[PDB]
Amino acid sequence: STRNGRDSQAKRLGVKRYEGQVVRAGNILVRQRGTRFKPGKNVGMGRDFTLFALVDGVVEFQDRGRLGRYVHVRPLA
Amino acid sequence: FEGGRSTTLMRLPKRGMQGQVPGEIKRPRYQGVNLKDLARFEGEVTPELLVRAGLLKKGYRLKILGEGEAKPLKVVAHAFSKSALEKLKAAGGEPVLLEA
Amino acid sequence: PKMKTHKGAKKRVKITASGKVVAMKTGKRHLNWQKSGKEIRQKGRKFVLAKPEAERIKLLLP
Amino acid sequence: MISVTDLRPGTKVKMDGGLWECVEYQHQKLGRGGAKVVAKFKNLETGATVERTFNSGEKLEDIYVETRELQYLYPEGEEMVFMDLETYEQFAVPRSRVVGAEFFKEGMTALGDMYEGQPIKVTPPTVVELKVVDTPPGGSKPATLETGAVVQVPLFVEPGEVIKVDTRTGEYVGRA
Amino acid sequence: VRIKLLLECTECKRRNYATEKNKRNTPNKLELRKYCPWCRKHTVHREV
RNA sequence: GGGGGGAACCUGGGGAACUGAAACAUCUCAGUACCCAGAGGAGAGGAAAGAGAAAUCGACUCCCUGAGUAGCGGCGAGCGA
RNA sequence: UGGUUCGUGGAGCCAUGGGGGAAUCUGGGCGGACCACCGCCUAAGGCUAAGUACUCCGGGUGACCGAUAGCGCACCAGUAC
RNA sequence: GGGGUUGUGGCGUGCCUAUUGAAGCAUGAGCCGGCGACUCACGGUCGUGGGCGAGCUUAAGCCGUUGAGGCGGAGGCGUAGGGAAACCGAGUCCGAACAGGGCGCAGUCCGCGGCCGUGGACCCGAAACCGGGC
RNA sequence: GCUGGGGCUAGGAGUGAAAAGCUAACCGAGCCCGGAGAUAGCUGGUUCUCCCCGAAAUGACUUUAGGGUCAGCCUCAGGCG
RNA sequence: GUGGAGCCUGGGAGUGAGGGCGCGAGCGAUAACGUCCGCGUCCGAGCGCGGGAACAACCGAGACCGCCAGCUAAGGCCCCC
RNA sequence: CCUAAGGUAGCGAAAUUCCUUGUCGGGUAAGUUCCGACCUGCACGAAAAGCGUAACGACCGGAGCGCUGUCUCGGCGAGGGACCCGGUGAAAUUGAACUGGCCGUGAAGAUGCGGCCUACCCGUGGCAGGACGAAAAGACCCCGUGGAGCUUUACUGCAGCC
RNA sequence: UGAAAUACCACCCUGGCGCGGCUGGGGGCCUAACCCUCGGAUGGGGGGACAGCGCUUGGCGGGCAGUUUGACUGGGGCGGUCGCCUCCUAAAAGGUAACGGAGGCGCCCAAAGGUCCCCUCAGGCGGGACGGAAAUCCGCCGGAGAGCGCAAGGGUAGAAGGGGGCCUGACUGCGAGGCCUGCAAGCCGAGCAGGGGCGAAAGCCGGGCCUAGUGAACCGGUGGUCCCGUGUGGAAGGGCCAU
Ligand SMILES: [Mg+2]
Ligand SMILES: [Mg+2]
Ligand SMILES: [Mg+2]
Ligand SMILES: [Mg+2]
Ligand SMILES: [Mg+2]
Ligand SMILES: [Mg+2]
Ligand SMILES: [Mg+2]
Ligand SMILES: [Mg+2]
Ligand SMILES: [Mg+2]
Ligand SMILES: [Mg+2]
Ligand SMILES: [Mg+2]
Ligand SMILES: [Mg+2]
Ligand SMILES: [Mg+2]
Ligand SMILES: [Mg+2]
Ligand SMILES: [Mg+2]
Ligand SMILES: [Mg+2]
Ligand SMILES: [Mg+2]
Ligand SMILES: [Mg+2]
Ligand SMILES: [Mg+2]
Ligand SMILES: [Mg+2]
Ligand SMILES: [Mg+2]
Ligand SMILES: [Mg+2]
Ligand SMILES: [Mg+2]
Ligand SMILES: [Mg+2]
Ligand SMILES: [Mg+2]
Ligand SMILES: [Mg+2]
Ligand SMILES: [Mg+2]
Ligand SMILES: [Mg+2]
Ligand SMILES: [Mg+2]
Ligand SMILES: [Mg+2]
Ligand SMILES: [Mg+2]
Ligand SMILES: [Mg+2]
Ligand SMILES: [Mg+2]
Ligand SMILES: [Mg+2]
Ligand SMILES: [Mg+2]
Ligand SMILES: [Mg+2]
Ligand SMILES: [Mg+2]
Ligand SMILES: [Mg+2]
Ligand SMILES: [Mg+2]
Ligand SMILES: [Mg+2]
Ligand SMILES: [Mg+2]
Ligand SMILES: [Mg+2]
Ligand SMILES: [Mg+2]
Ligand SMILES: [Mg+2]
Ligand SMILES: [Mg+2]
Ligand SMILES: [Mg+2]
Ligand SMILES: [Mg+2]
Ligand SMILES: [Mg+2]
Ligand SMILES: [Mg+2]
Ligand SMILES: [Mg+2]
Ligand SMILES: [Mg+2]
Ligand SMILES: [Mg+2]
Ligand SMILES: [Mg+2]
Ligand SMILES: [Mg+2]
Ligand SMILES: [Mg+2]
Ligand SMILES: [Mg+2]
Ligand SMILES: [Mg+2]
Ligand SMILES: [Mg+2]
Ligand SMILES: [Mg+2]
Ligand SMILES: [Mg+2]
Ligand SMILES: [Mg+2]
Ligand SMILES: [Mg+2]
Ligand SMILES: [Mg+2]
Ligand SMILES: [Mg+2]
Ligand SMILES: [Mg+2]
Ligand SMILES: [Mg+2]
Ligand SMILES: [Mg+2]
Ligand SMILES: [Mg+2]
Ligand SMILES: [Mg+2]
Ligand SMILES: [Mg+2]
Ligand SMILES: [Mg+2]
Ligand SMILES: [Mg+2]
Ligand SMILES: [Mg+2]
Ligand SMILES: [Mg+2]
Ligand SMILES: [Mg+2]
Ligand SMILES: [Mg+2]
Ligand SMILES: [Mg+2]
Ligand SMILES: [Mg+2]
Ligand SMILES: [Mg+2]
Ligand SMILES: [Mg+2]
Ligand SMILES: [Mg+2]
Ligand SMILES: [Mg+2]
Ligand SMILES: [Mg+2]
Ligand SMILES: [Mg+2]
Ligand SMILES: [Mg+2]
Ligand SMILES: [Mg+2]
Ligand SMILES: [Mg+2]
Ligand SMILES: [Mg+2]
Ligand SMILES: [Mg+2]
Ligand SMILES: [Mg+2]
Ligand SMILES: [Mg+2]
Ligand SMILES: [Mg+2]
Ligand SMILES: [Mg+2]
Ligand SMILES: [Mg+2]
Ligand SMILES: [Mg+2]
Ligand SMILES: [Mg+2]
Ligand SMILES: [Mg+2]
Ligand SMILES: [Mg+2]
Ligand SMILES: [Mg+2]
Ligand SMILES: [Mg+2]
Ligand SMILES: [Mg+2]
Ligand SMILES: [Mg+2]
Ligand SMILES: [Mg+2]
Ligand SMILES: [Mg+2]
Ligand SMILES: [Mg+2]
Ligand SMILES: [Mg+2]
Ligand SMILES: [Mg+2]
Ligand SMILES: [Mg+2]
Ligand SMILES: [Mg+2]
Ligand SMILES: [Mg+2]
Ligand SMILES: [Mg+2]
Ligand SMILES: [Mg+2]
Ligand SMILES: [Mg+2]
Ligand SMILES: [Mg+2]
Ligand SMILES: [Mg+2]
Ligand SMILES: [Mg+2]
Ligand SMILES: [Mg+2]
Ligand SMILES: [Mg+2]
Ligand SMILES: [Mg+2]
Ligand SMILES: [Mg+2]
Ligand SMILES: [Mg+2]
Ligand SMILES: [Mg+2]
Ligand SMILES: [Mg+2]
Ligand SMILES: [Mg+2]
Ligand SMILES: [Mg+2]
Ligand SMILES: [Mg+2]
Ligand SMILES: [Mg+2]
Ligand SMILES: [Mg+2]
Ligand SMILES: [Mg+2]
Ligand SMILES: [Mg+2]
Ligand SMILES: [Mg+2]
Ligand SMILES: [Mg+2]
Ligand SMILES: [Mg+2]
Ligand SMILES: [Mg+2]
Ligand SMILES: [Mg+2]
Ligand SMILES: [Mg+2]
Ligand SMILES: [Mg+2]
Ligand SMILES: [Mg+2]
Ligand SMILES: [Mg+2]
Ligand SMILES: [Mg+2]
Ligand SMILES: [Mg+2]
Ligand SMILES: [Mg+2]
Ligand SMILES: [Mg+2]
């Protein structure tokens, strides 16, 4: 007779498009709770903090020291 | 059927309106027929020369319409699509009204 | 003898010209109230996949 | 609709159209049969009790008879009005459902069993202060209290003197 | 909830609705705001 | 005149359950099994107080279509003009 | 209440156990609540071949059986038991 | 060159069923013979061999045969689709829209095989239930 | 009290000094024929040869857990390359 | 990287009791041929063959058939052998 | 404090007492039983009666006398079988058998695998340790959206009665 | 004056009589239906419009009938558990079990929502009238230990925190493209249109710092709409949108 045995259906978080991968405008690039990663160039983020491409291009992960981490998208030039 | 779940009878009957009781309202139904195919015969197409041909058949009320080019010939029908009415305005028939 | 159609289906689903099986969206019969227009609005018809193959074998004659 | 295996004294529920409150609860599972719940109850308005038994399944139907604190304001008809010193709503309780409505006081704070915003039991405190406005300065004499009721008191207790009276026995329990 | 309660909004004499959720007890005792109707555009809007 | 018999078939009077619904009760199985009365080489039905939308048809029965349609339905199972 | 696809449904139509209860063609019923138009038909008496069902019985056939099959019985079987 | 037999030598845990796993001390079988279980009807869906193709096909029946084959077009599937429907139609739905976006340009008839449905549906097996009788 | 002969009561019915006893050698509801080839998510059983490939015992939902549905894993034909 | 690889449309499945060993964890007692997951393996379906005395899953090794040829694996080389 | 009211008479380690072989007493060389008491009655109690009762009982307990093969502890003897010969001649069971022991091993209890040890072929009378011997498709146990009989303030009906 | 005040008008009560229509309750007596009886009667007694019986109503109703009485589970039962969120287990992608460890939810905010402009914390050492050990004030020191309605987690002072002004985009028609995924669902979403809010503008707004606060279909209810409306018109009843 216990008092536990509970949990929540996993949510499958994290980067969902890595640096150098080609996307299309719309692709959600990152799923995360806080803001582990922040919007960048052509990268708006959503209500739930979900970063998503804003234009067809590639993904770049700029690490900005104590300024956080960024995910940009340099469109195809 | 099965699992003992709920089939997929979860999806709903938006098919609203599908049955009163005396039954089905007896009303006139229309048969397509694109001018594209009256082009088969050249005379005076009348909804019958059609049934007998191989299109429409007993469905009753014929409504020549659609795609294809018209042809210089009289077309008696129970209806015409705005578009074919046109393509026939290129010279032909327009015996609308129809019926006694 | 002669297969019977599954009235409960024809009453809520449609076979399309392509062969597609289209059923109205589900989820807005009394949920509504605290539902974005996005949700409530997003109730158009939809594909149905892998289950239409089943779902279709019941509209046999129709 | 709560079952029984999930009762506890204090739980209030609706049985036989009436209001109760399990006051005794003991799970019973002897032999290899199915378990059984043997409780004892009390009506919320009348005192009547009744021990009963139920199987493991059987659901009961929990009720929401929370007990806020009301407040007397004024008489009217054969009723008297109170107020929940909380949301200041107005309750017109019929003299019957106001335990010891007499020996009360137009302004005293008492308790009521709110069942859907309508008290079915309005009790004051075991003893309240009241100004006797009667009695002959003459020992164990009768004394009409400011609320019209009468009570037995000693001598020294004379007109105007405010006393105490156990609202259960309406007996003089001393002076103010 | 109870103190909560559901409710919609009527275009002032007519149809349409919004259906939000008032909140009894606290800021309540009626309530109306400005919102856009399927027909024409923007107006007040009462409860009911 | 009647009475009793007759393998099925027939009409009428009564009339189940197991089953199916992956429980179950409405529903189904089915007005089937069966019981009883009667009929006869057949029985029923049959000349419109019908149909039902057609300036329409024109007793009745029977086959094929219409049609698994119209519908019916814990709108479930399924029944089905 | 029953019949119909109709499970109380907007529930007509047909039938009828109970209550009430007409008129005779300016009469009466139906066209799926109801109403008004427009139609259809003449209830509360009766009979009627033929087309249809079946196969104890006679015959004719058989990509039917050929004595553990075929009817239970090819034989003195609804028998011995 | 072969048959029969088999002394010694080497190797060697019946068969089926069911099981994670049986020689198993788990099930079934005394042995031999014969009977003994995935079919059929009407549908449906794939596939396939053919006929004919914007068309393909008849059903009851009728005439003929009497192991002879015709007729028969009622009807059926297909030529359009969308929409709950009115309706419209190579479009239409939603919409205020001339944005958007959802659905939209192929057949039939036989034979054959696979599988699904409805029937007892691969074959035996209940405890039981209901009717009428004894 | 025992006993012969003649009789009556029987199937959710009888009878019972009561045990759920007895009702034609097994009675918590007789026997026979019928509905009927009831249903059995259970146990058993399933018959000629060769050749190629060749699993699963997981997930999700399941009055689900020894059964299913979708998926995963196998296979065949057509297409792509 | 041409593989019994892949991918796409479709027909047919079976399976949805797994098991041991290794490694990483949880439950257990730093128990169990215990138990519940993960990565892998083998048995399952390789109770076919060598070694392990004998023995499904430990070591060796994936058995189309034939030969009185040869080299090797693990393991072995005093006799059984 | 609570209750509708808190078990009266009587009986009580009882066909009722868990603890329990309670504790005293009796009987006995020795008594978990028996009888008599005690009363912290786990969990008696008054017509599902309470407490007694002569008589009755193929009812159940305890004790003693008598007498015994019941026993110490077995012995002899009779007849009917058993065994032998002539006559008639079944049975369940049965995968096939060329059917040994120990120590191991193996699905964890081996005639059947390994190692070792025994062992000439075949019966007859006996014995029952094994062949997980025979017999009944476990009664127990769980499983089955199996079945029934029974119950009720489970659900829904029906007869009946109002 | 008393709890109340007083007129005049209202509405409506308590109980009362008056006409107008509408509905009932019983009391008796009768005999002839109906019932019971009587030396056998087209008759006499007794009961009597009661009962009995027919249709219909509400109820009582294990006397009887049909059935239901969940699953997981180190056997079953009893206990506990059953959906959703957070953390661990979970072996540095995702995912991953156990009657493994530990906690939450079934709500809530008309400001706790938009937007624009402002402000920066908890603590710590001083310093100060009433003043704890933090009430309010002043000075430093203090990058986040504060806060962010609630569990925990990620997040965050170059605000997601605090304050204020206007507001309500807690928009309607749409929705490219993705996440997650067996199905069904769940989640993110740029951009366009209509019509708005805030801002000088750039822009921002189709709820809430984010992960729980939930419920397929069926059957019905309310608005709306004009779509069908059983010969016609119209209703009845449906349909679609909304809830
Ligand atoms: Mg768990
Ligand atoms: Mg778990
Ligand atoms: Mg988890
Ligand atoms: Mg988690
Ligand atoms: Mg709706
Ligand atoms: Mg809309
Ligand atoms: Mg058709
Ligand atoms: Mg009949
Ligand atoms: Mg009959
Ligand atoms: Mg039944
Ligand atoms: Mg059933
Ligand atoms: Mg005749
Ligand atoms: Mg004839
Ligand atoms: Mg006749
Ligand atoms: Mg029927
Ligand atoms: Mg109904
Ligand atoms: Mg009916
Ligand atoms: Mg009538
Ligand atoms: Mg009637
Ligand atoms: Mg009439
Ligand atoms: Mg008519
Ligand atoms: Mg009429
Ligand atoms: Mg007529
Ligand atoms: Mg006649
Ligand atoms: Mg022959
Ligand atoms: Mg022979
Ligand atoms: Mg024979
Ligand atoms: Mg076998
Ligand atoms: Mg096993
Ligand atoms: Mg053996
Ligand atoms: Mg055994
Ligand atoms: Mg064996
Ligand atoms: Mg077995
Ligand atoms: Mg045997
Ligand atoms: Mg087959
Ligand atoms: Mg076929
Ligand atoms: Mg074919
Ligand atoms: Mg389009
Ligand atoms: Mg698209
Ligand atoms: Mg072809
Ligand atoms: Mg086929
Ligand atoms: Mg199939
Ligand atoms: Mg089949
Ligand atoms: Mg008889
Ligand atoms: Mg006698
Ligand atoms: Mg006799
Ligand atoms: Mg019977
Ligand atoms: Mg009886
Ligand atoms: Mg007797
Ligand atoms: Mg007997
Ligand atoms: Mg019986
Ligand atoms: Mg029985
Ligand atoms: Mg049957
Ligand atoms: Mg059978
Ligand atoms: Mg059954
Ligand atoms: Mg291979
Ligand atoms: Mg595996
Ligand atoms: Mg369920
Ligand atoms: Mg399973
Ligand atoms: Mg599958
Ligand atoms: Mg495949
Ligand atoms: Mg499993
Ligand atoms: Mg496993
Ligand atoms: Mg493994
Ligand atoms: Mg171990
Ligand atoms: Mg081992
Ligand atoms: Mg294990
Ligand atoms: Mg296996
Ligand atoms: Mg392998
Ligand atoms: Mg072996
Ligand atoms: Mg070797
Ligand atoms: Mg070896
Ligand atoms: Mg080996
Ligand atoms: Mg091996
Ligand atoms: Mg190989
Ligand atoms: Mg060598
Ligand atoms: Mg070597
Ligand atoms: Mg050597
Ligand atoms: Mg005692
Ligand atoms: Mg005594
Ligand atoms: Mg004693
Ligand atoms: Mg006792
Ligand atoms: Mg002594
Ligand atoms: Mg002595
Ligand atoms: Mg003693
Ligand atoms: Mg003794
Ligand atoms: Mg004693
Ligand atoms: Mg007693
Ligand atoms: Mg008593
Ligand atoms: Mg007695
Ligand atoms: Mg006594
Ligand atoms: Mg006696
Ligand atoms: Mg002796
Ligand atoms: Mg002797
Ligand atoms: Mg002798
Ligand atoms: Mg002798
Ligand atoms: Mg002899
Ligand atoms: Mg030997
Ligand atoms: Mg051994
Ligand atoms: Mg040996
Ligand atoms: Mg022996
Ligand atoms: Mg012996
Ligand atoms: Mg045995
Ligand atoms: Mg068994
Ligand atoms: Mg169950
Ligand atoms: Mg059952
Ligand atoms: Mg009188
Ligand atoms: Mg008389
Ligand atoms: Mg009289
Ligand atoms: Mg009289
Ligand atoms: Mg009467
Ligand atoms: Mg009644
Ligand atoms: Mg009852
Ligand atoms: Mg019962
Ligand atoms: Mg019965
Ligand atoms: Mg039944
Ligand atoms: Mg269970
Ligand atoms: Mg247990
Ligand atoms: Mg339980
Ligand atoms: Mg429980
Ligand atoms: Mg879920
Ligand atoms: Mg981790
Ligand atoms: Mg991970
Ligand atoms: Mg500070
Ligand atoms: Mg200080
Ligand atoms: Mg202070
Ligand atoms: Mg201070
Ligand atoms: Mg401080
Ligand atoms: Mg603001
Ligand atoms: Mg979209
Ligand atoms: Mg998309
Ligand atoms: Mg999906
Ligand atoms: Mg929130
Ligand atoms: Mg905010
Ligand atoms: Mg339903
Ligand atoms: Mg509705
Ligand atoms: Mg409505
Ligand atoms: Mg209209
Ligand atoms: Mg009509
Ligand atoms: Mg009409
Ligand atoms: Mg009309
Ligand atoms: Mg009019
Ligand atoms: Mg409407």
Side-chain angles (χ1 to χ4, degrees), chain A, chain B, chain C, chain D, chain E residues 5-48:
Chain A
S1 182
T2 336
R3 292 189 303 159
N4 306 109
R6 281 156 303 196
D7 199 78
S8 307
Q9 57 181 42
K11 301 314 204 322
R12 309 72 194 286
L13 299 169
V15 181
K16 304 261 182 188
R17 282 316 202 292
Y18 310 96
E19 179 169 285
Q21 301 194 195
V22 183
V23 301
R24 295 182 59 178
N27 291 43
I28 71 89
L29 308 180
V30 162
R31 279 293 190 161
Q32 44 163 57
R33 339 70 173 170
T35 181
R36 297 199 100 76
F37 294 77
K38 309 188 178 182
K41 305 164 185 173
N42 313 299
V43 190
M45 84 171 215
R47 315 190 38 276
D48 85 72
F49 291 91
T50 276
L51 323 177
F52 61 85
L54 256 159
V55 307
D56 290 43
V58 177
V59 185
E60 57 178 305
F61 283 74
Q62 190 190 188
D63 169 77
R64 302 277 291 293
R66 306 291 173 76
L67 261 178
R69 303 170 68 186
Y70 294 64
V71 171
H72 316 273
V73 180
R74 18 164 258 168
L76 34 37
Chain B
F1 274 139
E2 295 332 286
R5 301 212 244 76
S6 290
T7 49
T8 291
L9 195 126
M10 314 206 304
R11 31 51 171 161
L12 40 283
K14 181 245 173 43
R15 276 29 194 42
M17 191 179 280
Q18 23 65 170
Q20 198 67 319
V21 77
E24 122 171 312
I25 268 53
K26 180 138 176 53
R27 51 160 71 69
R29 37 159 286 167
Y30 287 122
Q31 180 71 180
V33 158
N34 294 173
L35 46 190
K36 163 183 65 185
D37 276 310
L38 292 65
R40 204 193 309 172
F41 25 92
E42 185 157 55
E44 190 192 80
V45 310
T46 51
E48 40 217 304
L49 178 173
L50 287 299
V51 307
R52 170 154 68 278
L55 52 184
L56 153 64
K57 64 205 313 181
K58 278 60 203 308
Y60 207 30
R61 293 199 176 62
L62 171 283
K63 177 174 176 170
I64 145 65
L65 84 192
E67 308 179 305
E69 310 305 75
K71 264 175 53 178
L73 36 63
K74 185 187 185 183
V75 300
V76 180
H78 294 272
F80 283 88
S81 76
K82 286 182 168 186
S83 158
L85 172 277
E86 298 300 56
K87 292 189 167 182
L88 267 69
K89 177 183 182 68
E94 191 205 292
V96 58
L97 183 58
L98 245 191
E99 288 297 357
Chain C
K2 161 185 280 188
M3 292 232 275
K4 273 173 183 179
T5 77
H6 186 246
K7 269 41 192 289
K10 172 204 279 182
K11 271 171 182 170
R12 75 186 74 188
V13 78
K14 181 191 166 186
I15 182 178
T16 73
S18 315
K20 308 197 176 191
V21 167
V22 174
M24 271 278 316
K25 253 305 173 186
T26 82
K28 66 163 188 179
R29 243 77 160 74
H30 72 335
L31 291 289
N32 310 224
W33 131 70
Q34 171 75 47
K35 265 172 158 65
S36 50
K38 185 189 165 194
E39 264 189 68
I40 291 184
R41 182 172 351 87
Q42 286 189 299
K43 272 60 217 288
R45 288 159 161 298
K46 61 167 179 302
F47 274 152
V48 202
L49 181 65
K51 276 58 167 53
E53 303 102 47
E55 205 77 36
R56 224 188 304 174
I57 298 188
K58 317 175 55 183
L59 298 175
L60 359 69
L61 310 136
Chain D
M1 292 290 272
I2 63 175
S3 82
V4 287
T5 62
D6 55 4
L7 301 197
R8 297 177 181 66
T11 296
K12 295 92 171 61
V13 53
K14 188 168 201 290
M15 276 204 307
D16 313 304
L19 315 194
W20 309 83
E21 171 207 49
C22 167
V23 324
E24 310 266 304
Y25 171 108
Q26 181 177 66
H27 178 85
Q28 195 193 13
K29 195 283 175 166
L30 38 71
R32 60 191 319 188
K36 244 171 175 61
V37 167
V38 186
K40 246 178 172 186
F41 300 56
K42 245 219 303 80
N43 279 311
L44 293 178
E45 6 56 47
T46 78
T49 59
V50 60
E51 161 142 71
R52 300 182 45 165
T53 299
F54 314 111
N55 280 307
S56 57
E58 280 181 345
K59 294 204 164 185
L60 263 286
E61 176 171 295
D62 58 322
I63 59 178
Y64 356 66
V65 170
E66 306 163 295
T67 284
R68 308 158 194 164
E69 179 184 4
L70 287 185
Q71 182 173 60
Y72 203 156
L73 292 189
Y74 61 104
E76 166 232 312
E78 292 309 303
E79 284 186 342
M80 38 199 273
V81 195
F82 303 98
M83 163 184 269
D84 186 44
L85 284 159
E86 201 75 39
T87 87
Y88 312 112
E89 58 274 59
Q90 219 117 286
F91 298 115
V93 181
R95 288 205 79 77
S96 69
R97 296 174 189 258
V98 174
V99 172
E102 354 59 58
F103 326 170
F104 237 68
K105 193 173 181 175
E106 292 105 65
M108 195 66 271
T109 52
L111 287 153
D113 287 49
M114 298 318 307
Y115 178 49
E116 306 179 314
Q118 304 292 156
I120 62 171
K121 178 220 214 63
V122 169
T123 62
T126 321
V127 170
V128 306
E129 291 190 298
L130 278 171
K131 161 162 290 185
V132 63
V133 294
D134 167 54
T135 217
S140 303
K141 56 224 184 179
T144 304
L145 281 280
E146 46 176 294
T147 69
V150 68
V151 59
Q152 294 301 301
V153 290
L155 271 184
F156 45 86
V157 286
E158 312 303 20
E161 204 166 315
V162 175
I163 55 184
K164 339 170 71 60
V165 180
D166 192 51
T167 67
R168 324 313 182 180
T169 51
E171 295 186 307
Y172 163 80
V173 297
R175 325 190 300 177
Chain E
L5 138 180
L6 311 307
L7 216 296
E8 44 238 297
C9 313
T10 180
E11 184 183 70
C12 303
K13 198 278 175 293
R14 49 280 177 185
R15 71 202 53 133
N16 173 224
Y17 302 78
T19 81
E20 329 266 65
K21 96 182 73 187
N22 195 345
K23 289 295 190 178
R24 279 254 78 285
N25 291 310
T26 55
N28 255 66
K29 295 278 73 179
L30 311 167
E31 78 103 301
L32 75 171
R33 305 235 97 92
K34 184 180 290 300
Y35 165 95
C36 167
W38 65 289
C39 0
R40 263 300 163 283
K41 308 303 300 176
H42 283 68
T43 69
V44 197
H45 275 68
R46 320 274 180 172
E47 309 163 73
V48 198

